[PDB]
Amino acid sequence: TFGYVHGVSGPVVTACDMAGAAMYELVRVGHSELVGEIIRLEGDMATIQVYEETSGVSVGDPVLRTGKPLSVELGPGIMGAIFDGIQRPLSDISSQTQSIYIPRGVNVSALSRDIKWEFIPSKNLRVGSHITGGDIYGIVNENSLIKHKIMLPPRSRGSVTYIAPPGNYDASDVVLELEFEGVKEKLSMVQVWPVRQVRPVTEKLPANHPLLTGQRVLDALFPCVQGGTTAIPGAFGCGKTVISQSLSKYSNSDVIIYVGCGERGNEMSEVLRDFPELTMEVDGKVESIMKRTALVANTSNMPVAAREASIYTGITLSEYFRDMGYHVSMMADSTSRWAEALREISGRLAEMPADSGYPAYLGARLASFYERAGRVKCLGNPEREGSVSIVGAVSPPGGDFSDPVTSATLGIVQVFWGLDKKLAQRKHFPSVNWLISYSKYMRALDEYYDKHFTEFVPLRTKAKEILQEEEDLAEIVQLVGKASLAETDKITLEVAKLIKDDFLQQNGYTPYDRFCPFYKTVGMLSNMISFYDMARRAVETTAQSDNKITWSIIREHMGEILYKLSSMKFKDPVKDGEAKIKADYAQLLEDMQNAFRSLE
Amino acid sequence: ALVANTSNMPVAAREASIYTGITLSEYFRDMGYHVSMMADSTSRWAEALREISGRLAEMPADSGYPAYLGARLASFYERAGRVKCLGNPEREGSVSIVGAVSPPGGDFSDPVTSATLGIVQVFWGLDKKLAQRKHFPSVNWLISYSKYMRALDEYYDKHFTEFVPLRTKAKEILQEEEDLAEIVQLVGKASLAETDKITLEVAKLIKDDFLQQNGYTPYDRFCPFYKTVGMLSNMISFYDMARRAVETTAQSDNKITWSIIREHMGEILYKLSSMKFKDPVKDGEAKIKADYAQLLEDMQNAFRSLE
Amino acid sequence: ALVANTSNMPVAAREASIYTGITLSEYFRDMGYHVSMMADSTSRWAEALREISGRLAEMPADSGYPAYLGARLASFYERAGRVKCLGNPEREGSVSIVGAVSPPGGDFSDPVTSATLGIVQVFWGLDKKLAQRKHFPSVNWLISYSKYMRALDE
Amino acid sequence: YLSQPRLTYKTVSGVNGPLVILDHVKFPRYAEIVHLTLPDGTKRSGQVLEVSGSKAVVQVFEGTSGIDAKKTSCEFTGDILRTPVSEDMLGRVFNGSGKPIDRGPVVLAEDFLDIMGQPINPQCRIYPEEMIQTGISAIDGMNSIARGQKIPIFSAAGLPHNEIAAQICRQAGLVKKENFAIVFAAMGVNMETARFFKSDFEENGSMDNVCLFLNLANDPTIERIITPRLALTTAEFLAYQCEKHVLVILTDMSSYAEALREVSAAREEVPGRRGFPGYMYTDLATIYERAGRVEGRNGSITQIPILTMPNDDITHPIPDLTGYITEGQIYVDRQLHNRQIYPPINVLPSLSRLMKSAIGEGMTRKDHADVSNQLYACYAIGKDVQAMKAVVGEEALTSDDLLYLEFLQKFEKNFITQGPYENRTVYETLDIGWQLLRIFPKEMLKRIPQSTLSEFYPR
Amino acid sequence: KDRIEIFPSRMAQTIMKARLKGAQTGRNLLKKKSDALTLRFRQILKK
Amino acid sequence: SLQTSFVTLDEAIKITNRRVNAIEHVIIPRIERTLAYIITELDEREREEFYRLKKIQEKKKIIKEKSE
């Protein structure tokens, strides 16, 4: 399984006596076991691209051939760990060496083999039974939140010949043995899957269930769906933290994966420092977010292969848990950094560049990356279902949208949560642009909304009309000063302000506004629009002659009602239950309609 | 006769097609006939040369094209020309070449358009922004030129005489309108003199009624020369009379502004625009010339009543 | 004592002309004399380097120039300055170098202009608009600089 | 037929990108197909793109990841990719490799046709002289579709070009006042787009006359440049051997061009613009020109090769070279879509080369050509007036300018705006044309002769 | 028309970028002139 | 002096705003289109240089192999 180094021209190492090797196989070059891949082959010689520095590699050094291509090691212990882009545990490398550096040629197993996991068989299988790929034959108890279901690796099947009894096993033991056509396969709790291959599913289903983030904006006006794909701008002042924390903390997904692609060292530190400090209430207990999270960390000075592979390692980990029946939400901190890594490799290989210097296949790689997301029917007899969502961010040089990476991304993702910096400067959070943002899942969710909430859909339509009209009126107001302006337009302007102030704006540093349940979001919007409609009628039905109602009359007449509408965001779901908050909102509507009644 | 080597046919055959075509043309030239061959592509031929040069692993020149691209185009176009033929019978013939070029994006910067313009003596540039307006033929008329104007001046004097000063005045009007359009976009037609507004509207008259024609109609499918110069004479005669009308009154006790002549002579402006709808096959030269003569008289009489 | 080399001379002599000139300059520098060396053009030198780099079929850099263009210009430009000479007499001479970058334009992306600017301490840029207006000497005096201010303040 | 056993080789010389180079091959044939098995049993296929002596260069469709150098086993079929075709392919769903994905059987061939096809003899090609009624006024009036025409829709990411194509599939008829077999090549698209069309075809109740070829975003990029040829090869069988009228729709052709560009870079071919091969035009012609009627046979192929314009750049090589090959384009844009106008078809930069033959006496109505040309003039001028008024202000405009703004505003909401299920006839479209043209006095309708205005304008 | 029609070059980039900066500066200075005239106009209007 | 100093202000504003609008709607868009055109065409020239240099390096490699 060894060959020899024939020569080094830089980061590219030529091997000889390496006839038995496949393209994009893995090699460990030299006495330090440098990680690299085989790209070009000719005769019994192979051209190796080495990820790390090749200084010190000699002619005649050994090359160890590893049969598996670039792959992710999947099994118990994946949760709570931080990985390199090529699946190297950073929390073990820093703790097994007492160093601050990642050793050159470091070789730490992705999943430690010194942990004795609590494994319980499915108790449904027997020796002699038939098992197929994707089947679950036992569960490992990792923590209080996520059960780690042990699946038969894809592309394997047969009759079960041995089942381990319940007990404490590590990742190097044998848990299940199966025989197919006389060939016996001994399986541990760990499976390996090539990172560039898509894990098969029974069928790919439409995405219909909303992604229940805690923000009123980026939900009511611009829905995302479990299994859907969106894009988030990444600029210093855009306030992207709000989405990252809200999505990872309060989402209705089961597993969070955060993927770095190649960011500034200090930015990776902020993410690695923040995440371990995040908690959420679960069964009444406050639990660490890292018990249901996995994180992949890559800084700009990491090997380019890892920065390019990081995005595929992340989604491979996501699919692994998807196949368990979990809903997984993966965030790519910057897909622009990934695209930069991809262009660097294309340049290093002297490939013909295309648009703005990027590889010709940039678009194909992004399209095939995002296509891997979605709600699926899983493999295996348990007939379970799950999904992968992607909320990958874009940060093109200059902030422009002409960069092929952002332009291609926007043509692929179905939701765009356009953020802005001006809003942040005005201290308006979350910093959502509104006019640029869009969601193409609105039709997919119409069945969910009709079934569970009924009035939500016409309300969000009216809300967009009111907000858009406020923008449309901007030129008239600037040139007029609200003097030569219709009273019906004054209602739109002031109500749109109410929406912008006490609905779309959300203050995550307050205990009552940490998470806004959907029923509260639609409750608040219903009463605000119901007021809008009543105010429009109050003016229009009396605007003929003699005695007419104006906005100044409405505002002065029922100022307490306009205040009560603004006060609605303070209804803390932790102390005031669903029935109490709905009851208070129902009373507000009645008080509101009755206040208008006195005007007619 | 025609040669077909369509886009989805072997790319190498595109070179043979061009050379077969011109060789056929020369053959008939030698017999005392005037040949006017046209290859509707050129760029597709140069494209074939690029694809072959690539397969040959040759060193490319500008934008991937072979260094000898210019050599092939020069030797192709120079086979055109009026000649005295070989042969005791003393024949006289010609081959004209009217070759299309397909610049990508409409940008006249590619090696094929650039090399072609250095070879051909008449440049019929087309403007995509005129075609979008269905202003056909989409001739730019600002960047086009013909280097045979001086050669034909003798011909025109022999048969027409009036054509050449009309050609000159028409170009001056169109160029003046362009010079004004550049600033009018910014001013808003506020600082225009009455003499300039006449230029702008007569230039429109020329553009809409003279420079464009619908080649898929019984009347514009063919435009006999006598009709082109006839209706141009009327359009220029209007320009000179309308410009005189204001030039002789601007300093008087009533200036004939465009709005006065426009309302007073609106029927003349419609008649001038109708001059295209003459159907030369149904109504022959005698009726068309008499009709144009009547429009000139109608203009002169309306001007006498105006000024 | 001048060194004469025209555009129709061999490319190697076009390259070597600068080296011959500065060799004579240092020679007299070591006598304790103050030497002032004026070049007619260093863009022609860079052109010679581009021509030879091509002929040798070595990998070029920007606009066809050799990647080491900056090294050749630095080698020439750094052979100057007030020195304490070798030899018993303790004499001190100097070489001043005045380069000359022929401008394809006012864009300092020009490989020769850029490499020169990173080395030379004084840059007397000549404005195109002042030349067109026949304002002589034509100096932009907003894009020019001299890095010897503090040295001359004494 | 080929009776000689095929040879199998384990002589792979080397692998460079997507190209597997074999040596020791007996009499290599150019553009022949090779079937190869990987050490793990995976089967893949590729085509010989170069032969020299005993060497041959095979481009592998599925990819070259996992291809060995010593254990790889390859066999040469001995012919070009000739594919099985049969009449009963209608109602089947295939992948981009030509294999079924609808849980039905493989194709039980009536013959084997060369995927590369053959050029149709221009002397037997018959010029199209029949109009298709798309039901969309923006098309039937000002940019008519002929049967045998090639008309792509130039679009942009996010625009409803999939809905327009779907609409056309259901309400495409004749103006002779007819069941088209649809062959739909869904390449470089996501699941939802392919499912959208698949569902619509069943919703229309026409699935028994629809043949699908799917190649999704997560499928190999090399198969994406044969999928159109598979669709067209079937269309050619149906149209020219079984005299069935076929409508062939190729989804975002830009995924074809991008797949081709990747191949061009891999083979180090001479680039033209934006990195695309200098022969991109010739390759596109091989795809596009498989259309039109043939004299003496009652079939036809009509194409709608919709494409996405990168960054809305109409001069991008993809729409540019297509524009040179196809008989014009429909062209949709964002300025109409951003105002909730459907279909968002912008007539100004559009054209139909076969439209002039398609309209008029004996085809639709004698005033068709006149109405179209004047609508173009009035629409374009209205756009010019907006460009002016944006700077000078409404007060700087005269009555001659306001009329064009009135036309422009009424034109877009009356002529272009229709709705996904609004099916208008060509005669109704012209009637609407007149209703808008009658905004202006006769003297301003300068593209229409008085011999037409005097009859139609009074109404 | 659509472009200033300066042949592509790095020199053209420098000229166009300087021309753009000039146009943007003029736009902002004239906008301030307009705002000053508009305020004075409205004041005159009030009096 | 109000009315005579007022309509002159309305005329001055209309002239100033018209010039500002032209800079915004005509002159700058035109400069931006020109600049974007230049940027694209320069990258196209960079590519054709890349192609030739790559082929030169490959031809040198072929010569070197023949020499061995």
Short mmCIF file of N, CA and C in Angstrom, two decimals, chain A residues 472-577:
data_model
loop_
_atom_site.label_atom_id
_atom_site.label_comp_id
_atom_site.label_asym_id
_atom_site.label_seq_id
_atom_site.Cartn_x
_atom_site.Cartn_y
_atom_site.Cartn_z
N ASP A 472 -43.52 54.05 -1.83
CA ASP A 472 -44.06 54.72 -3.01
C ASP A 472 -44.44 56.16 -2.71
N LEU A 473 -44.94 56.42 -1.50
CA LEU A 473 -45.34 57.78 -1.13
C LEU A 473 -44.14 58.66 -0.79
N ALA A 474 -42.94 58.08 -0.69
CA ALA A 474 -41.81 58.83 -0.17
C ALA A 474 -41.55 60.09 -0.99
N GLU A 475 -41.66 59.98 -2.32
CA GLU A 475 -41.39 61.13 -3.17
C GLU A 475 -42.44 62.22 -2.98
N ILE A 476 -43.70 61.82 -2.83
CA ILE A 476 -44.77 62.79 -2.61
C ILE A 476 -44.55 63.53 -1.30
N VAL A 477 -44.22 62.79 -0.24
CA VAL A 477 -44.00 63.42 1.07
C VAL A 477 -42.82 64.38 1.00
N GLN A 478 -41.73 63.97 0.36
CA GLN A 478 -40.54 64.83 0.31
C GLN A 478 -40.85 66.16 -0.34
N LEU A 479 -41.72 66.16 -1.36
CA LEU A 479 -41.97 67.39 -2.11
C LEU A 479 -43.17 68.15 -1.57
N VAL A 480 -43.84 67.62 -0.55
CA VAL A 480 -45.10 68.17 -0.08
C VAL A 480 -45.06 68.48 1.42
N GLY A 481 -44.48 67.58 2.21
CA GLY A 481 -44.51 67.73 3.65
C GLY A 481 -45.80 67.27 4.30
N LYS A 482 -46.51 66.33 3.68
CA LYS A 482 -47.79 65.81 4.17
C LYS A 482 -48.89 66.87 4.21
N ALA A 483 -48.71 67.99 3.52
CA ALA A 483 -49.76 69.00 3.41
C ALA A 483 -50.80 68.66 2.34
N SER A 484 -50.40 68.68 1.07
CA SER A 484 -51.28 68.27 -0.02
C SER A 484 -51.27 66.75 -0.13
N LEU A 485 -51.75 66.08 0.91
CA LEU A 485 -51.68 64.63 0.99
C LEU A 485 -53.02 64.09 1.47
N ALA A 486 -53.46 62.99 0.87
CA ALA A 486 -54.73 62.40 1.24
C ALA A 486 -54.66 61.88 2.68
N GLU A 487 -55.79 61.96 3.37
CA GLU A 487 -55.88 61.44 4.76
C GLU A 487 -55.68 59.92 4.73
N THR A 488 -56.11 59.27 3.66
CA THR A 488 -55.91 57.83 3.53
C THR A 488 -54.43 57.50 3.38
N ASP A 489 -53.66 58.41 2.79
CA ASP A 489 -52.22 58.20 2.69
C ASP A 489 -51.53 58.44 4.02
N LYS A 490 -52.02 59.42 4.78
CA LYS A 490 -51.48 59.68 6.14
C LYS A 490 -51.65 58.43 7.00
N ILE A 491 -52.79 57.74 6.86
CA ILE A 491 -53.02 56.48 7.62
C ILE A 491 -51.95 55.47 7.22
N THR A 492 -51.75 55.30 5.91
CA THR A 492 -50.75 54.36 5.43
C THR A 492 -49.37 54.71 5.97
N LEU A 493 -49.00 55.99 5.95
CA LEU A 493 -47.65 56.36 6.36
C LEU A 493 -47.45 56.06 7.84
N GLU A 494 -48.43 56.45 8.65
CA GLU A 494 -48.28 56.36 10.12
C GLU A 494 -48.43 54.90 10.56
N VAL A 495 -49.34 54.16 9.93
CA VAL A 495 -49.46 52.74 10.24
C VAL A 495 -48.22 51.98 9.77
N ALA A 496 -47.70 52.30 8.58
CA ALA A 496 -46.45 51.68 8.15
C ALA A 496 -45.34 51.94 9.15
N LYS A 497 -45.29 53.15 9.71
CA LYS A 497 -44.34 53.43 10.78
C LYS A 497 -44.58 52.52 11.97
N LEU A 498 -45.84 52.40 12.39
CA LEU A 498 -46.17 51.48 13.49
C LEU A 498 -45.64 50.08 13.21
N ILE A 499 -45.78 49.62 11.96
CA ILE A 499 -45.33 48.27 11.60
C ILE A 499 -43.81 48.18 11.71
N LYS A 500 -43.15 49.21 11.20
CA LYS A 500 -41.68 49.28 11.14
C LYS A 500 -41.16 49.37 12.57
N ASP A 501 -41.88 50.09 13.43
CA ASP A 501 -41.39 50.36 14.80
C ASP A 501 -41.73 49.17 15.70
N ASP A 502 -43.00 48.77 15.75
CA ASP A 502 -43.41 47.87 16.82
C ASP A 502 -43.77 46.47 16.33
N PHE A 503 -43.35 46.11 15.12
CA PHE A 503 -43.56 44.77 14.60
C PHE A 503 -42.29 44.23 13.94
N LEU A 504 -41.88 44.85 12.83
CA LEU A 504 -40.72 44.32 12.08
C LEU A 504 -39.46 44.47 12.94
N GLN A 505 -39.40 45.52 13.76
CA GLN A 505 -38.26 45.70 14.69
C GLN A 505 -38.43 44.75 15.88
N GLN A 506 -37.34 44.11 16.30
CA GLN A 506 -37.38 43.14 17.40
C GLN A 506 -36.10 43.28 18.22
N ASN A 507 -36.24 43.33 19.54
CA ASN A 507 -35.10 43.62 20.39
C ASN A 507 -34.71 42.36 21.16
N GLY A 508 -33.71 41.65 20.65
CA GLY A 508 -33.32 40.37 21.22
C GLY A 508 -32.60 40.41 22.54
N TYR A 509 -32.38 41.59 23.11
CA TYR A 509 -31.64 41.71 24.36
C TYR A 509 -32.61 41.86 25.54
N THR A 510 -33.90 41.78 25.22
CA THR A 510 -34.97 41.85 26.21
C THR A 510 -35.50 40.45 26.44
N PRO A 511 -35.81 40.09 27.69
CA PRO A 511 -36.24 38.71 27.95
C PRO A 511 -37.59 38.38 27.34
N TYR A 512 -38.45 39.37 27.11
CA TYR A 512 -39.78 39.08 26.60
C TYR A 512 -39.79 38.91 25.09
N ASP A 513 -38.78 39.45 24.41
CA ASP A 513 -38.73 39.47 22.95
C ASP A 513 -37.67 38.54 22.39
N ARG A 514 -37.13 37.64 23.22
CA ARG A 514 -36.10 36.72 22.76
C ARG A 514 -36.62 35.84 21.63
N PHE A 515 -37.87 35.40 21.73
CA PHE A 515 -38.49 34.52 20.76
C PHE A 515 -39.95 34.92 20.63
N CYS A 516 -40.40 35.15 19.40
CA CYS A 516 -41.78 35.51 19.15
C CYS A 516 -42.52 34.33 18.54
N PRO A 517 -43.37 33.63 19.29
CA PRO A 517 -44.11 32.51 18.71
C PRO A 517 -44.93 32.98 17.53
N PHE A 518 -45.15 32.07 16.58
CA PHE A 518 -45.88 32.46 15.39
C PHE A 518 -47.25 33.03 15.74
N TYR A 519 -47.96 32.39 16.66
CA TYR A 519 -49.31 32.86 16.99
C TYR A 519 -49.28 34.29 17.50
N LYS A 520 -48.19 34.69 18.15
CA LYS A 520 -48.03 36.09 18.53
C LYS A 520 -47.71 36.98 17.35
N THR A 521 -46.89 36.51 16.41
CA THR A 521 -46.56 37.32 15.25
C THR A 521 -47.81 37.63 14.43
N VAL A 522 -48.63 36.62 14.17
CA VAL A 522 -49.85 36.85 13.40
C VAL A 522 -50.88 37.60 14.24
N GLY A 523 -50.89 37.37 15.56
CA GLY A 523 -51.75 38.17 16.42
C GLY A 523 -51.46 39.65 16.32
N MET A 524 -50.18 40.02 16.49
CA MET A 524 -49.79 41.42 16.38
C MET A 524 -50.13 41.98 15.00
N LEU A 525 -49.79 41.27 13.93
CA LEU A 525 -50.05 41.82 12.61
C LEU A 525 -51.54 41.93 12.32
N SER A 526 -52.34 40.97 12.79
CA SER A 526 -53.78 41.01 12.55
C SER A 526 -54.38 42.27 13.14
N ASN A 527 -54.02 42.60 14.37
CA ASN A 527 -54.63 43.77 15.00
C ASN A 527 -54.17 45.06 14.35
N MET A 528 -52.91 45.12 13.90
CA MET A 528 -52.42 46.34 13.26
C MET A 528 -53.11 46.58 11.92
N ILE A 529 -53.27 45.51 11.15
CA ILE A 529 -53.92 45.65 9.82
C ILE A 529 -55.41 45.87 10.06
N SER A 530 -56.01 45.15 11.01
CA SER A 530 -57.45 45.39 11.30
C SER A 530 -57.66 46.87 11.63
N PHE A 531 -56.76 47.45 12.44
CA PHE A 531 -56.82 48.91 12.69
C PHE A 531 -56.71 49.64 11.35
N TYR A 532 -55.71 49.28 10.54
CA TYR A 532 -55.52 49.99 9.26
C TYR A 532 -56.85 49.99 8.50
N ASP A 533 -57.47 48.82 8.37
CA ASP A 533 -58.70 48.71 7.54
C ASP A 533 -59.80 49.59 8.15
N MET A 534 -59.92 49.58 9.48
CA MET A 534 -60.98 50.37 10.15
C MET A 534 -60.69 51.85 9.92
N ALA A 535 -59.42 52.25 9.99
CA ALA A 535 -59.05 53.67 9.82
C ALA A 535 -59.35 54.09 8.38
N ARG A 536 -59.05 53.23 7.42
CA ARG A 536 -59.33 53.57 6.00
C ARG A 536 -60.84 53.76 5.85
N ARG A 537 -61.63 52.84 6.40
CA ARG A 537 -63.11 52.94 6.28
C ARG A 537 -63.61 54.20 6.99
N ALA A 538 -63.05 54.52 8.16
CA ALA A 538 -63.54 55.68 8.96
C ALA A 538 -63.45 56.94 8.11
N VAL A 539 -62.37 57.07 7.33
CA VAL A 539 -62.14 58.28 6.49
C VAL A 539 -62.98 58.17 5.22
N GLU A 540 -62.84 57.06 4.49
CA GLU A 540 -63.47 56.91 3.20
C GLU A 540 -65.00 56.92 3.27
N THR A 541 -65.59 56.31 4.29
CA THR A 541 -67.05 56.26 4.35
C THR A 541 -67.65 57.60 4.77
N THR A 542 -66.82 58.53 5.24
CA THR A 542 -67.28 59.83 5.69
C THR A 542 -66.71 60.98 4.87
N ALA A 543 -66.00 60.67 3.79
CA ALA A 543 -65.25 61.68 3.06
C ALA A 543 -66.09 62.41 2.02
N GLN A 544 -67.40 62.19 1.99
CA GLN A 544 -68.21 62.79 0.94
C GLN A 544 -68.32 64.30 1.10
N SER A 545 -68.89 64.74 2.22
CA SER A 545 -69.16 66.16 2.44
C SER A 545 -69.51 66.45 3.90
N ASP A 546 -69.47 67.73 4.27
CA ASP A 546 -70.09 68.26 5.49
C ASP A 546 -69.36 67.86 6.76
N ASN A 547 -69.31 66.56 7.04
CA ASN A 547 -68.76 66.05 8.29
C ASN A 547 -67.93 64.81 7.97
N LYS A 548 -66.62 65.00 7.89
CA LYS A 548 -65.71 63.93 7.50
C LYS A 548 -64.75 63.67 8.64
N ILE A 549 -64.25 62.43 8.69
CA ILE A 549 -63.22 61.94 9.66
C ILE A 549 -61.84 62.10 9.02
N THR A 550 -60.86 62.61 9.77
CA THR A 550 -59.47 62.73 9.25
C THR A 550 -58.53 61.91 10.13
N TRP A 551 -57.28 61.72 9.71
CA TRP A 551 -56.33 60.95 10.55
C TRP A 551 -56.08 61.70 11.86
N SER A 552 -56.02 63.04 11.81
CA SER A 552 -55.74 63.80 13.06
C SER A 552 -56.87 63.51 14.04
N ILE A 553 -58.11 63.44 13.54
CA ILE A 553 -59.29 63.17 14.41
C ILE A 553 -59.15 61.75 14.98
N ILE A 554 -58.81 60.78 14.14
CA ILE A 554 -58.70 59.36 14.60
C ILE A 554 -57.59 59.29 15.66
N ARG A 555 -56.43 59.87 15.35
CA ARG A 555 -55.25 59.74 16.24
C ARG A 555 -55.57 60.39 17.58
N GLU A 556 -56.21 61.56 17.55
CA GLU A 556 -56.52 62.29 18.80
C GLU A 556 -57.65 61.56 19.53
N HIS A 557 -58.63 61.07 18.77
CA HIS A 557 -59.81 60.42 19.33
C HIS A 557 -59.47 59.16 20.10
N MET A 558 -58.66 58.27 19.52
CA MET A 558 -58.36 56.99 20.15
C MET A 558 -56.86 56.77 20.34
N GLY A 559 -56.16 57.78 20.86
CA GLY A 559 -54.74 57.64 21.10
C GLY A 559 -54.37 56.46 21.98
N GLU A 560 -55.25 56.10 22.92
CA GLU A 560 -55.00 54.92 23.79
C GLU A 560 -54.96 53.64 22.95
N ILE A 561 -55.79 53.56 21.90
CA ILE A 561 -55.83 52.34 21.04
C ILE A 561 -54.52 52.24 20.26
N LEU A 562 -54.04 53.35 19.71
CA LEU A 562 -52.76 53.34 18.94
C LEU A 562 -51.63 52.93 19.89
N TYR A 563 -51.64 53.44 21.12
CA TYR A 563 -50.65 53.01 22.13
C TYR A 563 -50.77 51.51 22.40
N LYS A 564 -51.99 51.03 22.65
CA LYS A 564 -52.18 49.59 22.98
C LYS A 564 -51.62 48.72 21.85
N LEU A 565 -51.80 49.14 20.60
CA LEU A 565 -51.23 48.40 19.45
C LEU A 565 -49.71 48.35 19.59
N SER A 566 -49.08 49.48 19.89
CA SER A 566 -47.60 49.49 20.06
C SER A 566 -47.19 48.60 21.23
N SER A 567 -48.02 48.53 22.28
CA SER A 567 -47.69 47.79 23.52
C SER A 567 -47.71 46.27 23.31
N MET A 568 -48.29 45.80 22.21
CA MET A 568 -48.52 44.34 22.01
C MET A 568 -47.23 43.52 22.06
N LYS A 569 -46.10 44.06 21.60
CA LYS A 569 -44.81 43.31 21.59
C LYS A 569 -44.36 42.95 23.01
N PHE A 570 -44.89 43.60 24.05
CA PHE A 570 -44.41 43.34 25.43
C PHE A 570 -45.10 42.14 26.08
N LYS A 571 -46.00 41.46 25.37
CA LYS A 571 -46.70 40.28 25.94
C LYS A 571 -45.76 39.06 25.99
N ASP A 572 -45.00 38.91 27.08
CA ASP A 572 -44.00 37.87 27.30
C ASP A 572 -44.55 36.44 27.27
N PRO A 573 -44.28 35.67 26.23
CA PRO A 573 -44.82 34.30 26.17
C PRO A 573 -44.39 33.40 27.32
N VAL A 574 -43.31 33.75 28.02
CA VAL A 574 -42.86 32.90 29.13
C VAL A 574 -43.81 32.99 30.32
N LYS A 575 -44.43 34.15 30.55
CA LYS A 575 -45.27 34.30 31.73
C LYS A 575 -46.74 34.34 31.34
N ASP A 576 -47.06 34.95 30.21
CA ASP A 576 -48.44 35.02 29.75
C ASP A 576 -48.65 33.94 28.69
N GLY A 577 -49.48 32.95 29.01
CA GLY A 577 -49.70 31.83 28.13
C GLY A 577 -50.48 32.16 26.88
#
